[PDB]
Each structure stands twice: as C-alpha cells, then as structure tokens.
Symmetry: D2
Subunit: 334 residues, 4 copies
C-alpha cells in the first residue's frame, strides 16, 4: 500500500474552529502550569492504550463531566495513546495495527486516529498522546494539547528535536533506569532551536528549522524504585533548579511507580494528595491509567477493558479524581 | 535551501563494482564472526569523529597496510563516525556542520560523507558508522560494512526497526547504566521483520516491510563500572545464551571502559589480549578510538587530531593492533 | 495544496463491478476498432457535465436504451468536464466545480471521480477527453473510451499519453479538415515511448508505455462537413495506405452539424443510409445530448447544457432508434 | 529514476553573470516586442543540438558577430535539443536509442550555462510541461511549436515563464491560433505543474506580457510584405502586439536550406522600404551546411539541413545593413 501523506487526512478531517480553539487554550493553560502561573493540577488520565474508538468516546463522555466539575482544581486531559511501546512482542497499537489482527493498515489506522481525536476535541475533551515516531505526528499533532516522550526515547536526539518543533507542552520521562538527568537534559535540548530533518505534510523529507519548545517538563515514573514521594520530588526539583529549567513536574501513578499493579495507583495518588495538602509546590500534574473497566485482557473480548497495561476502572477513577481535586482545592487556597 | 533526496547523491556518486564487492564480502565476513563460524577478531578502529576527509584518508592508507598485514588474525574496519552526540554543547558533526563554522549545510554534508565513504571502499578500506536517525542512512548505507546503534537510542523502537532493515551487521550497546538487557531486547526486535515508516531514495515517506537483521550483537561499553574483563564477559555471555541470541560480543576499549582516558585503551586491549591467549571464546571484536595524532583539541587547528574524544596516536595504534594480532593468532591455533 | 491521485483512490476505490464494466467495454470497443464486431459504438451525452445530479438522471435514462439496443449499438456515455474555450468562459467542472470562477481542483477531481464511479456502478460505461498529463491518473481507471482534443492531436506529449492509456482512444481530424495529423497520431500512440509523467503518488517520473493498439480516427468536419460516404471512403483509403485501422468514428455534432444542434439528426440519417447500403468503415458515432434540448449561458434550467447546444431527450430517443434500426440491417448481412 | 530539478540546480547553479545576461536579454527582447527598441532579434543556430563541442564552437563564432552587430541586430543562439518526429539530445543524449533523460537534462543545463557564461544568450522550444524548470532560468527566449500553439496546457506553461515567448501559426498556416495563444498566455492561470522538487502542484501563474507571433509558412509561404500587413491587421484587430517574427527556414524556405537567404532578402527589402512590424527572424545555421542521417561530420545537422557558416556571415551582414537604415529613419 502507498502511504498517504498528512494532507490527505487533513483534507477529509480538517480541524474545526471549536477544536482548534480548545487545543490553543488548553496548550496555553498547561503552559501556565509548567511555569507556575496557575496552581491547578494537570491530570493526564485514560486508557493505557486505545483499541476501541467507541469505548474511548463513552470514556470521554464520563471523563468530561468530571473535567467540568473539577475545572477550578484540576485540568483534566484524556490519554489517547495509540500503543504501548514494546520491550517486545504484543500488539503495536491502533495506528500500526487497527484491526487487531496483525495486518498492518497504517493508512486506516492514521485515519481512525485522526477521527477519534477530532471527535474528542469536538465534544470538549482535549487529548494527549505519546509521540513515538518522527513521521506520524504530522497526521494529528494539531489535535493534541499535551505530548509525552517515553522513557525509552527521552534520550534520543531526534525525539528531542521532534519536541522542539511541537506546539504543545511536552513531558519527558525519567529513564527506565530511574535516571532523571536524561529528562532534564531533554528539556534543555527541546527548548533550543534545531535544524532537523523531518517530513512535510505533503510526504517529502525536508529540513525544518524548529523554534524551540519553551513548555517542557519532567515526568517521574519510577525506576529501580518508585520516585513519587516528597523526598524524590524534592531532589528532582533541586536538580531541575541547578540546570536552570522549570521545577514543576508530573508524577505518573502507574507503570514503575505503581510497580505494575493497577491497584496501587490509588495509593500513589493518596501520597500525592498528602504532598499537595502539606506543600507540594513542585507538582504541576499527574498521570493515571484508567478505563471503564479495571484490569486487562489479552484479547479485546470485554468492552472498555485494556489490552495493554492494566487500568483502574471507572468507579476507582471517580474516587481518585475526587481525592485529588479536594487536596488541590486546599493548596490553591494558601 | 531545499533537501536533496538520496537519488541525487547516488547519481553523482554511484557505488563502484569494487566498493560493492568489498561491502558484500566484508558484511559476510563479519556475519561469520557474529555467529562463530570464523575466529578472526573484528576491529573497529579510527577517529572518534571525522571532521576532515584529508586526514581521514591518510589515516586509512596507513590503516590499510595493517589490515592486509593482520588479515589472518584480525578483520580490520575503519571507524567513520560523523559525530559524538553532545547534550546541547558544541559542534553537531560533519553531516550537520560540514564547514566547522556553526552553520548547517546538510546537502553539502551528506555529499561529503558519501564521497569519503566511496573513496575509502575504493582504496580497499571497509567502513563502519553509527546510524543516528531514520532519514540520513539512505544516503550512504550501501557503503557501510558494520553499523552501530548509539547507547542513547538502544531502547528506541524506531532505531530497532531501522536496524531490522539494514543489510550490514549491527551492534547495540549496553545502557548508560551498565545494563545489558536493553541491548539483548534490541537484538530481539531487530532480528524480526517490521512494518514501519521510512523514506525512500526518492525522498518520500513510505511503508517498509523489513526482512529482519540476523547479524546483530552486543557491545560492552562500561556503565558505572567498566565491563571488559573475563568475569563481565562470562556473565554477559550467559545472559545472551539464556535469551537464545548470539553469545559472541564486542568490547569497547574506549570511553567508560577506558574511564574516558585515551591513555588506557591499551590497558583494556591488554586485558582483552590475555583473555584471547587463555580462552576468550565469546569475544568477536573490539572498538578503538585512534587518529594520526594522540589527544584532542577544542578547535580544528592541528591536522589529524580529534576535536571530539581524545584518541590514541598512530604509534600507539600500531602497538595495539600488533598486540591483538599476536594474541588472536594464538586463540586461532588452539 | 494538490492531493495526489492515491488520496482520491483511497476514498473512492474502484469497485469490482466498475472494474468489470470497464474491462469488458474496452475489449468490446477494441473489437469494433479492429472489425471483429460490427455493433456501432455511440458516444452520447452532454457537451459538458455541470451538474452530477442531471448527469445521473441522464445516465439512468440512457442505460435503458443501452440495453434495448445492446445487439445493434454499444452505448457509452459522454462525460466531458469542459469545452475547451479559446476565450473567457467557465473552465469546466474539474477546474471550477462550484460554477463561480473559483478554482478548487481537489474538490473538482474528487467530484469527477465520484460521478464516474457512480456511473460505472449503475452499469453505464463512461468516456472522456484527456486534456493534460496530470489529471487522467485521478480517474482513467474508470474510463472505457477516451478522446484527445482537436487542439492537441498534433501535440507529441498528448500522443505519448495515449500510448500509455489502457482504453481505446480517438483522435480528431484538424480544424483544417486535416486527416493526416490523426493518422500520424495513431501512428505515434501505437508505439512504446519513454516519457515523463506524474505517478499515482504525485511525483514526476520516467514511464515506459507499452503502446496503445486500439486507437482510431474521428471525423469532425472542416471547413466543410465530412460525415458522408464520399468523405468516409476517402478517409479509409488513407488509413489503409498508412497501415492503420480503417474503422472510424464520426461526430454528428459540432462542425459536422454546422454548429447547429437541430442538424445532428440529419447527420445520423445520412449515417443510417450509409449503414443500410454498406458503411463497413464506420465503427462509431458521437452525439451531444441532454435531458432538455438547447443551451443556456447560466445553469438556470435543470438538465440543459451551458456549453454547446444539445439535442433533448425526445430527439435522443429518435436518433438512437434510427441507428439501431439501420445497424440491425448492416449486422444481418 | 527521474531526478528533480533541484538536483541539477545544486550541481549547476546559475552564475552571477548568466543571471545578468538572461535578465538583460529578456528585458531587451521585451523592448522589441513593445516597440522601445528597433533592433532585429535574430534567433539563429542549429536545427538541433546533438554535440555540445560543436555548439560551443558555433557559439564562439556567433558571439563575435553578436558584438559586431549589437547596434542593429540582437543575436541569440538557437539551442533546441530536438525536432518533433532520433528523439533529440535530452531524450536520447547518447544518440543510440537508450533514453537517458537524467544525463540529457544535465548535459542540457550544462551547455546552456556555459553559453550564457561566455556572453551568448540562448533560446529553445518548450515542448513539455515537466522539463522547462530544469533550465528555464538560462533561457532568454522561448518558442511553442506549431504543433502545440493550440494546446491549452502549453499556453498556461508560457503564462508562467519569465522570458518572452513566440507562438507559431499552425501547420495549417493558421494565424488565429497563435493570436488566441498570446491572449491566453498574457492572462493569469491556475494550472497544474511540477515543482523544482518533483511534485505535482497548483501554481498560480502571473501572466506573460511579452508574447508574440512567429510566421512560418502554410499552405503558402507567408513571409512577404503583403502577408505581414495581413498579420499586423489581425493582431491590432485582436488588441495584441502587432510586432512579429518571421522564420526563414522550414515552410517559408519550402524546406530548402539554400532558400533561407532568399527569405532574408525579402525581409531586408521590407526593412529598407518600411518593414515597421517585423521585430525578429529565425534562421537554421550550423558550422557546415546540409545535413546527414548519422553524425559523422562535425558541425553538420542530423535533423533539418542548415546553412553553413560562410552563408551565415552573408545572411547576417545583409540583415544588419538593412536594419541600420530602418533604425536611421
Ligand atoms: Mn501503560
Ligand atoms: Mn568517541
Ligand atoms: Mn460540444
Ligand atoms: Mn528545424
């Protein structure tokens, strides 16, 4: 199959006025969190990965009510990640393999991804994703209010350059090691201007002079040990001030910080709430892996149940958000 | 100024019949080493970085003599790296900054890199390089007999896919932590077939189905602790066997193993040499950083003196190669 | 920003049934060009397409005649998107799809492919004029017979294009009355060429064409009209002397009709008589027809040309029954 | 695999001096088209270029006459790579039927650049929608063939070119097609083209205000005073420049090279009597006269027969002398 260029997809699914309005302001609102001008708490919450658009839309419908209810405390954004990167061997995600049958139908996957994101934004839910790849971003980055670079790629030069060219805030994860320095450096690198090689909306390789991305930050996501608590937060903030970059950071309640057990996500959030109640001046956000139904499954049999990492279910998601708004209500009052 | 596609470079500088046979043959020869079919020692030696083609060619002429001289003991290949990754400080290498003046001139830079490579293979010197991104390899991979993926991108899914479609053998580095698993996972992923995005010789994005690369292997390059000795090699080999991948590996004499001191490359070589005399079954090659003149300089004033990592000079290079040839002749005769 | 053909092919893939109609009809026409079959090819429909709704209603009506007369005539609809005008005027549905002087080529190519896919799906093959080297890729797969413009029959690059098409192509005699250029053009179109063109992915490239063996001539007047037996017999002699097929198409409209739509029927009558007598050299005719007769400067009335004047449906029924009847007798000898 | 223009522009960028010469020659020919200068444009040289060595040798000689006659004639070399029919130098640069277009475009661009750099401006016929951008930048004057003057896509092409362009009457002898072609190419167009990078694209051309007609025979040869007055009328009637070019070879010579001089004589006399509407002539000329089927003799055509150098000297002197008088009055 010939790969369709971005312009093909952009022509069928142009950004709407409302969607570009929401991306613009959500980007702006998050910038304010990164630089300490607003004290609301970014919450990146949703499925480990998107495998069904229908489930994703219903998830977004519920999430949206809670984003509106808690809007003075939290800034809620949906995880719309298309894949779980592989150490090896599972399913590569919606874009790479949208039919979940090992066919590669990238053209269909990118169309479906663009469509899901346009629809979420159109209903009022801004969206987040991880940019793995140097070529796919162009397809839907205009519908993204916040991007991640993963633990496995935060050290990659071309990923740092990718980030320097995006128009959304970007979070960089510490190494699968626990190494924070690679993420701090990455901030350095992404904030500067670069002469990169990328591919245009028309599908041709090209030189792009990036403008630098001034709204990057660190994500604490565990390593050898969990790095979510106050002491790890304090040490990180120190390192961040020493490199002269922002000391506002995000914490991932999931992955290595929950030690690969979804039931511990709540416990990590409880620890974060307590830091917000005492002080927690260095935290601008959190990350949660959440779905309609808890746990995981190998085959997409059950509706709204993850097929990559296990997630908490809707019930626990309600509790968890209520917990963080409350604790953040108090921090914003001091 | 606009970016030229690989076909423009291939039309000025087509691969000669001699270079392509030299490449086909050297790749096959290295595959024999990776899979334990031959017991010669692969030796990847040469400047930390190429900043001058003239000095580079003169280096190769001398190195060519030793390659012939030790051809029954050592398989010698020139290091032809166009940069040292640098986290935000200094010269971006010869492809990005070919004029060494801080400008960016990638059309000139890719042209000059291909020229050099074409001239090295025509004189009878095979070449090795590090593939950093997904776009530039297409400009000269046909001239490369062995490649490396940088420690910084070892975990990167997109670099693993890159390696899976390269036709040369590829070596992957243990992590900046001393960590071997990530290199072994990389061999895993790079040996499989992948559906990925890349850019054709014509400069267009496209879907590629890679065939998988069977000749990948590990490179031991230190972590917090140097990892060139018997014990580390023994331990490395076990992990490799337990993962069902080749237990033949390469050891970096430079950088962390040298404790970042160019005067210690010889020490590490000695240790490797004693392993070869004794047993050394699991060693298939070594990396060495070497130039016409020893040391380093901040600015490119002195002819044939590195402006990136410090290198051993030509004299010490002859002594080291002689030491390795002699040790390996002994291994080969048992 | 111009979208490559692959973008339109992804949204509007050719269906199996369209695929089979195109294939079948190109072969069927091929047999007319080379005299293996004696049915009369009729290219018929509006001068230009300005409204897909009317074109669809027209195709529906035509399809029924296509079947009624299926043993005497091979009816293929005319789906031209413009009349080339040597003065100011509407640039046609591909360039100006919105009919407001806008240029919106993406929308226009998409709409053209869609109409053409809809027509093949309903069971009506389609013909068109290929006017340039770039747009045909977007829908050539949906076309059973093509024409090269009278203005481009001498153009080497348009001859190279015909050599690459997989449908039969017709070449017109020169506004002069000139037949040599069409004969030369068949000459050239039948050979392999190494030309430059644009790929499905939107890139310039070298293509090696295989030759198009199913080309033929179209008689479209002077100067003086050239549809009668005397002109026909003369064309055939030259075609033979050139060693190319001596089966030809005659255009009932335009200059052969003295630029008057009410005279298309008279040209058809004369062709009917020739078919009744002998007319062994005629393999097809061309007719400008719409739902309603005539023309109008603005698109005010439904199914009425805004380019050249066409006969209406009433006259269309009459003209076709005449050629079926007359060709029935040809085929029975 | 077709290289894009940018690959050839990267190897062979226009020099400071070539840029100057092109801009100046377009501007000077423009002056002839619009009646600010009364020199005679002479488009002269080989029928087709099949050897760059010969072409550079010919240019070297033509240069000397371009200087000698710079106050009377504006001499521009004819650098046409083919004759519509051997498929020409760009298609078949090796003259062996192997179609190495990449080599042929490169060699085409190289020769053009050398010619400009030696002080010799250059003209060619744009046949094709895709090739022009590989070297339009080195051309001071373009032609559209009689066989494409009616083509809409070739009119649009000329609409986007920065050099004056001449349009031929048809193989008819039909002038109206070249007249409607000026109208069309003078307007702005939304046409499809190919970028310097090799991708198809929408380009909005700005219009070409320096176009004009080329009289090149019928029918009956159409070079004389009467035929000229007839064309002028129609051109004025059509509201376009009544200043035109006359081809001395091809139809107007009855396909006879020896007769080229004859046409030039008629033209000279008009230039002396009055000849106000003539701004240019075209002549087919090589180092050696005649023609050949195989390229065995150096400097001799293998498409249309040309005059040799000796006759070129005479034909040029005759046109300069005649035009000096016109410019005197
Ligand atoms: Mn996950
Ligand atoms: Mn180094
Ligand atoms: Mn018409
Ligand atoms: Mn000629």
């Amino acid at each position: 199959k010939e790969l369709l260029p971005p312009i093909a997809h952009l022509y069928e699914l142009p950004i709407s006025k409302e969607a570009s309005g929401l991306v613009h302001r959500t980007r702006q609102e998050i910038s304010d969190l990164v630089h300490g001008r607003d004290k609301r708490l970014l919450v990146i919450i949703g499925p480990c990965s998107i495998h069904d658009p229908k489930a994703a839309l219903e998830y977004a419908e519920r999430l949206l009510k809670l984003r509106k209810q808690y809007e003075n405390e939290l800034l809620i954004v949906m995880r719309v990640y298309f894949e779980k990167p592989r150490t090896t061997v599972g399913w590569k995600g919606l874009i790479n393999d949208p039919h979940l049958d090992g066919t590669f139908d990238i053209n269909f996957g990118l169309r479906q991804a663009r469509s899901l994101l346009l629809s979420l934004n159109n209903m009022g839910m801004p969206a987040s994703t991880e940019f793995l790849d140097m070529i796919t971003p162009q397809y839907y980055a205009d519908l993204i209010s916040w991007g991640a670079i993963g633990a496995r790629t935060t050290e990659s030069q071309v990923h740092r350059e990718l980030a320097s060219g995006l128009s959304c805030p970007v979070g960089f994860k510490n190494g699968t090691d626990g190494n924070l320095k690679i993420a701090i450096d990455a901030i350095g690198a992404a904030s500067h201007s670069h002469h990169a090689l990328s591919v245009t909306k028309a599908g041709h390789s090209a030189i792009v002079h990036t403008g630098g991305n001034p709204d990057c930050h660190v994500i604490l996501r565990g390593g050898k040990e969990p790095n979510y608590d106050a002491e790890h937060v304090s040490e990180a903030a120190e390192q961040l001030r020493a490199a002269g970059v922002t000391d506002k950071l995000m914490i991932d309640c999931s992955h290595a910080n929950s030690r690969k057990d979804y039931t511990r996500q709540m416990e990590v959030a409880q620890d974060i709430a307590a830091q917000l109640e005492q002080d927690g001046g260095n935290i601008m956000g959190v990350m949660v892996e959440s779905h309609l139904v808890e746990g995981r499954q190998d085959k997409p049999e059950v509706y709204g149940k993850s097929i990559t990492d296990a997630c908490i279910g809707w019930g626990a998601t309600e509790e968890l958000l209520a917990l963080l708004a409350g604790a953040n209500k108090k921090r914003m009052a001091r």
